[PDB]
Motif scaffolding. Sequence first.
Motif, PDB file in Angstrom:
ATOM      1  N   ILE A   1       2.467  12.025   0.548  1.00 15.04           N
ATOM      2  CA  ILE A   1       2.905  11.815   1.913  1.00 15.04           C
ATOM      3  C   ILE A   1       4.239  12.512   2.074  1.00 15.04           C
TER       4      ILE A   1
ATOM      5  N   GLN B   1      -0.507  12.269   6.865  1.00 16.22           N
ATOM      6  CA  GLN B   1      -1.358  11.125   6.578  1.00 16.22           C
ATOM      7  C   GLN B   1      -2.491  11.545   5.665  1.00 16.22           C
ATOM      8  N   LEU B   2      -2.648  10.812   4.570  1.00 18.47           N
ATOM      9  CA  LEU B   2      -3.754  11.040   3.655  1.00 18.47           C
ATOM     10  C   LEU B   2      -5.019  10.560   4.344  1.00 18.47           C
ATOM     11  N   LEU B   3      -5.701  11.481   5.021  1.00 12.93           N
ATOM     12  CA  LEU B   3      -6.888  11.094   5.764  1.00 12.93           C
ATOM     13  C   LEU B   3      -8.013  10.700   4.830  1.00 12.93           C
TER      14      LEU B   3
ATOM     15  N   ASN C   1     -11.486  11.840   2.283  1.00 12.73           N
ATOM     16  CA  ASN C   1     -12.583  12.777   2.031  1.00 12.73           C
ATOM     17  C   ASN C   1     -12.029  14.124   1.585  1.00 12.73           C
TER      18      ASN C   1
ATOM     19  N   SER D   1       2.572   4.266  21.592  1.00 16.61           N
ATOM     20  CA  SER D   1       2.886   2.875  21.874  1.00 16.61           C
ATOM     21  C   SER D   1       3.580   2.726  23.217  1.00 16.61           C
ATOM     22  CB  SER D   1       3.742   2.297  20.754  1.00 16.61           C
TER      23      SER D   1
ATOM     24  N   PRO E   1       4.195   4.854  18.184  1.00 14.54           N
ATOM     25  CA  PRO E   1       4.664   3.653  17.485  1.00 14.54           C
ATOM     26  C   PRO E   1       5.666   3.981  16.410  1.00 14.54           C
TER      27      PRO E   1
ATOM     28  N   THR F   1      10.935   3.181  13.395  1.00 14.51           N
ATOM     29  CA  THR F   1      11.446   3.367  12.046  1.00 14.51           C
ATOM     30  C   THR F   1      11.854   4.803  11.814  1.00 14.51           C
TER      31      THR F   1
ATOM     32  N   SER G   1      15.390   5.702  10.511  1.00 14.90           N
ATOM     33  CA  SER G   1      15.614   6.575   9.373  1.00 14.90           C
ATOM     34  C   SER G   1      16.581   7.687   9.725  1.00 14.90           C
ATOM     35  CB  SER G   1      14.286   7.154   8.904  1.00 14.90           C
TER      36      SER G   1
ATOM     37  N   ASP H   1     -14.917   8.852   3.799  1.00 13.63           N
ATOM     38  CA  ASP H   1     -14.342   8.973   2.464  1.00 13.63           C
ATOM     39  C   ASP H   1     -15.106   8.147   1.443  1.00 13.63           C
TER      40      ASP H   1
ATOM     41  N   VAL I   1      -5.640   5.525   3.980  1.00 15.43           N
ATOM     42  CA  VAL I   1      -4.264   5.071   3.973  1.00 15.43           C
ATOM     43  C   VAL I   1      -3.487   5.941   4.938  1.00 15.43           C
TER      44      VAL I   1
ATOM     45  N   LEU J   1       4.543   6.750  -0.271  1.00 11.64           N
ATOM     46  CA  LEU J   1       4.279   8.138  -0.612  1.00 11.64           C
ATOM     47  C   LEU J   1       3.753   8.271  -2.028  1.00 11.64           C
TER      48      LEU J   1
ATOM     49  N   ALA K   1      16.933  -1.011   9.860  1.00 15.66           N
ATOM     50  CA  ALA K   1      15.818  -0.530  10.664  1.00 15.66           C
ATOM     51  C   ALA K   1      14.948   0.463   9.905  1.00 15.66           C
ATOM     52  CB  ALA K   1      16.350   0.094  11.950  1.00 15.66           C
ATOM     53  N   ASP K   2      15.524   1.195   8.960  1.00 17.58           N
ATOM     54  CA  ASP K   2      14.759   2.229   8.278  1.00 17.58           C
ATOM     55  C   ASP K   2      13.749   1.670   7.289  1.00 17.58           C
TER      56      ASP K   2
ATOM     57  N   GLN L   1       4.797  -1.779  16.494  1.00 19.72           N
ATOM     58  CA  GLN L   1       4.428  -0.674  15.638  1.00 19.72           C
ATOM     59  C   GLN L   1       3.482  -1.098  14.534  1.00 19.72           C
TER      60      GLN L   1
ATOM     61  N   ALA M   1       3.042  -2.547  24.373  1.00 15.52           N
ATOM     62  CA  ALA M   1       2.346  -2.349  23.108  1.00 15.52           C
ATOM     63  C   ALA M   1       2.490  -3.530  22.167  1.00 15.52           C
ATOM     64  CB  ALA M   1       2.802  -1.060  22.412  1.00 15.52           C
TER      65      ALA M   1
END
Lengths: 479, 478, 51, 504
Positions: free
Chosen positions: B27, B51-53, B55, B278, B284, B288, B292, D7, D35, D81, D229-230, D273, D286
């Motif tokens: 990621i 994003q690790l989709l 397949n 969102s 959304p 964060t 960050s 998958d 994921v 990650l 927040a992070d 979120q 939301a």
Amino acid sequence: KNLGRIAQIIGPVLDVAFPPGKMPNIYNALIVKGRDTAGQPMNVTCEVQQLLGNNRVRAVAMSATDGLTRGMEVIDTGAPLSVPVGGATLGRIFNVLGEPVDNLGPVDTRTTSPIHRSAPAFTQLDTKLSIFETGIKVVDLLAPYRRGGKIGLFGGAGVGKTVLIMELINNIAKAHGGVSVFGGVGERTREGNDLYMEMKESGVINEQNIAESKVALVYGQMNEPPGARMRVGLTALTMAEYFRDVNEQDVLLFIDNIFRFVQAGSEVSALLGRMPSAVGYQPTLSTEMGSLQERITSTKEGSITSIQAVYVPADDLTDPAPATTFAHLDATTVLSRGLAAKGIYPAVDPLDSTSTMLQPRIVGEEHYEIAQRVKETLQRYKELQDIIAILGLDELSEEDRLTVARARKIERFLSQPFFVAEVFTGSPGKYVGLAETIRGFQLILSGELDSLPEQAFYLVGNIDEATAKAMNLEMESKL
Amino acid sequence: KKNLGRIAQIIGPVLDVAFPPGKMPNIYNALIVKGRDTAGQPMNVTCEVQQLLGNNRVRAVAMSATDGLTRGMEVIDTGAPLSVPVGGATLGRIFNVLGEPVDNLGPVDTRTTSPIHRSAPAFTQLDTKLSIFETGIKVVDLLAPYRRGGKIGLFGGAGVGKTVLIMELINNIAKAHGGVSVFGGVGERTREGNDLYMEMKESGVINEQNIAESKVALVYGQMNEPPGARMRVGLTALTMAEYFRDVNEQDVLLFIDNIFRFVQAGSEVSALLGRMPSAVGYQPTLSTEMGSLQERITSTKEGSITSIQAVYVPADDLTDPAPATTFAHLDATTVLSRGLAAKGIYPAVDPLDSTSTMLQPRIVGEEHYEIAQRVKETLQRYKELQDIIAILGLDELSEEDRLTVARARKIERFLSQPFFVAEVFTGSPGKYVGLAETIRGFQLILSGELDSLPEQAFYLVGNIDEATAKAMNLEMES
Amino acid sequence: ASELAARMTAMSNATDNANELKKTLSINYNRARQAKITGEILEIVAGANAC
Amino acid sequence: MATIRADEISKIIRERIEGYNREVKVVNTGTVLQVGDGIARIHGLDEVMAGELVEFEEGTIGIALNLESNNVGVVLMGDGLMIQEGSSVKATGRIAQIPVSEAYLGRVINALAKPIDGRGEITASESRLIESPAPGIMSRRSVYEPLQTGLIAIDAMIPVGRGQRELIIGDRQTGKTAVATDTILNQQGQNVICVYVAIGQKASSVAQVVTNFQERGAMEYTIVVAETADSPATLQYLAPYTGAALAEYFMYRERHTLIIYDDLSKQAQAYRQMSLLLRRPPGREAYPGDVFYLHSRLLERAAKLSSLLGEGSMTALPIVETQAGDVSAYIPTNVISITDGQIFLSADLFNAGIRPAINVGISVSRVGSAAQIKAMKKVAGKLKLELAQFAELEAFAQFASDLDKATQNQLARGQRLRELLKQPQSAPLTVEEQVMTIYTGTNGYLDSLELDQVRKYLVELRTYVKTNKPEFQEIISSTKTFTEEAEALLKEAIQEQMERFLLQ
């Protein structure tokens, strides 16, 4: 034998796998037995929301799902939840499942009543509207009850809608000798514990004289789940049918929080995947509150007088909750956050609380004529108040300023004290009889105590007591 | 043997890439297409593995433009967060968001490259002094004392000259701060970016000769940037700033704009990503993410990070969840009015609307916060007075009401002072208005000493002495 | 007569300022009408993934 | 299963081919099938009970969000990650445990029940469930106790209650946490365990108030719960439950104890979120519906317990953020529905100079003088609505011009009361000193006094009464009753310092 496998767990939404043929009916009670955090088998009572299909079904939980691994077995008992009903509740703080919140003796579960029972017939209702008195001055002044009907409170936030209801509860509950039935749902354990304390203190919980207790408690506070917050109103309705249908008494039905009662299944429809309705609304919530109000009916057996109360959502009246509630309630009370901004407690929405029994046919043209003059002056007062805040009290004409005096006054003398209020207020409450304030408002629009102050009208009991407070403040102005 | 996944699917700068089923990259792993233009093999698709989709496929934020990208093109993934030419190599280098030179200078020394997806400075590791920072501008000194070592921001609507006030801020603080300066043009109208490059040259903050000794670095992602390009441009700017604040351990003068545009870029990026937007338009992820952003912007103990940033406060909605979400994380947001520029105040900050963590008697001096609260409540009373002033007019008002009204009117007018570089629109050479001369001017104004000086004379008048001379000109004008 | 005239002039200027503030208020009102429509659009949008 | 079957193809549909006429259980390890960004859809781990932690194969605690059929959505507490596709998250089984004792008090705990302060691991051997259940009404006693705000306007207007649940609505830099900070300073003598919960605040400012609390030594009484927040919205949304667990450790330790939750509106957007991170159906701004219930799950954890439950005072201090004070926010609407009585502020008054800027008519005591000392509940007992009504008449006054003797008199009494509201920033009073000022204004003896004189006059009154009527201090303290001996002492030294300050 129809065991369910807990197929999928999405919040209170549960996909269940009951067997292919043995998938139960709608509104079915089911019990997901499993290892608790105790490891003991907690059986999760739950209601069949809807057939997902293929022997899987959508189901709202009543318990908390925390600990539900999937595939877990669920006793689909199949039918609507039978509440322990009648006098067994009268004294018992039941849970939404009817479990004793009171730490009481267990209810006579032989009394038992299916939850989503339907609503009555237009034939089957008792058919005369009656002024259920209040002890609450401007309430009984501005609007008379239809006893046996729907007392509705569209509520502000922390409004003292609680308080208004509480003093009303005190007064009408000592008056009406029916078994009172308080439902504290979506509410504060502080507020509800105060309610239980003041019902024992009001003799109606009757901690000694349990089941000589002239009250029951239904508990559905906001710490419960939303599915728990969904169902509990019908449980109140089932106890209501046991006392007003079955025990056939002139029933007393305190019911709140009806907006939270909306808000739960409102929240659960998307959890059900029922599509997004309005601003928080579930779709057929119209019909849901319609079954609520229609189930809340004075039968020919008993008069189901029904204290209902929803949070007027952020004082939005067109908000779909009170919008739906407008046809529902018989006598209705918005409060005025202006009058709460005027500081009144009772802060009655003076132009904006009406009643079916508000009529010269009903209340008498004495009362209706008096209120006609009263609300007339009050309305033109609100009208000319705009030209006041733009144009100053200097701009006032003669009768306008007399009306303005009448406005601030009849505002203040319309405010009464509750003996309930005496910690948040600190005043002695006067259970204000109706024709006393009919005399007082006849005098106020007669300008008798126009000599007196609205300070001397502020939160008092009698027009004689108002003149007395005028005497007190006059002699204090001497000092 | 890094995984050269095929270009699985391409829509927007989110490309899907089929990595090896064993070897999917991390990621936020960087990646690069084998790549082409028509002109040869432009391999330029470095990419942020979002994003690790699955397949063996995964959706990713390509850091460039997506033309010609053949479905199935082999992207060798870097398998790691993108590293940028951090440190004093960038000092002088207008760095691209790619870490490449947007200056078209020489390709900078790759010794200090850095993973911009990086940790934040700890509450143990952060410095903790509530030192203010000197301004030279009127309410910028006074009302919101800008704190030394902090992400002082400016929330403003478009066409504020958030450009303008930021550049005058750059002009003052740049010569002022001997700390290392790092500006992030981020979605900027790079006409003004070219102005900024010309200005750094003109200041010697690009000391072009001794380009290493420029001691102020540029990181530009223009308006024409794509959004995933505009996504982590601030992250790269922060990374080189972190080289300054930790590696160099220098004082991080760190200006950047526009963070609301950065939010808008992340919004449309997540709109590409297949995630439910969102807020009104916002992702959304916005929460964060901006946390960050502000979290790397912690004033470290090695180098405190005087990080001036800007919010393109959109639609004049403070309750836009962008500016709302920002209003927490900034330390001192100068709220720039549109309205005071309709009154003509350049700068047009509603000083009423801005707020300082630094605003305290214990912090600013009790004299400063006392006179400040006096002027602040003068403003508040003036705004309250505006209501009855609007329809009725002041003839119904009181004489103490008129006293306060003209008084705070004088306060507002004396709050208008020119800015240093601001002439290019207007023509005025600004006064770097010091805090104490401002304090004396506030003293005269609220104390009604200046209540014989004229309000129009105080307009864009720097010192109360300068106001006195301007009023002497006006009183001479007859 | 001076009092009558100045009162009249103040009320006239007030009426001008009034219709001005009226236009500003109705402008923000229809702006909020768009805002309520936008909230409705948001409620529509969640249904697009829902049903 | 449009997501899973894609998958599944490499392994899990190859497994489905492998185990078709076969009924199996992979029911412990969710190989992390899909994921994204803290949200996983891990195939398997079906026997993971709901609410469990999930020991991710790389090492991360996936929080149990939703059991879908094939995979399940799980919320990563950490930075995932590390995790590769199909990582066998073991189900970590402990369903929201919480290392809980008094060990974190005196430490800025991180959200993991780890110290953010670097004061080492709080040896907190108990495991209170983080998602705790709540205090029943039968489990509740009424909050008989008064809590000491120190904000004499607050405890004048809205009675701070031990066990009680008030929320502070505010403004962008209300600095509302500083009001909480002085409350903690008031709590620093109050024998109450203290919690300074911090969701998404400026960690700079978190350290600023942390230094101020350490310097205050309320950080002795306090733990600091902290998730800036992070961090994960797992942590951010969830951390209120963790503070509730520590509180219930102190409250099933029966103590007077109080918590200060720095904005859950931050946590509201965090769980918003989370909901969109679930890719679920969200709603008003939301939010899901349940967040209010989750707020309720937050809120009603804090009550005056029964004496059967130990009479444990778990007092609540929320400071909900609000966009410019817009109560119609579903965040603000649920909070308005939630906290029994709430503290509306109006930072207009902070810009007008009232620091505290208590929006008095808008701030609400649902409780009332039950959480006031009978000294104060007697003394300023009719004074809250009095200041409201003095404001109400003064509101009705600027329309008028010629202020009558009743009118100008009540206006003088009220303007006096408004200056008498003005306690300076961290100028706490003893409820002795507070109710002393209340008896001054309540006997009206400074309705005479001009407010410029009255500020310092009340100060000198406070100092003289600190000297001359410390007996009356112990009277209002000890008797908890503004006796006529005490109120006479009040009037007595009131006349005395009235002489001493008219002298000044």
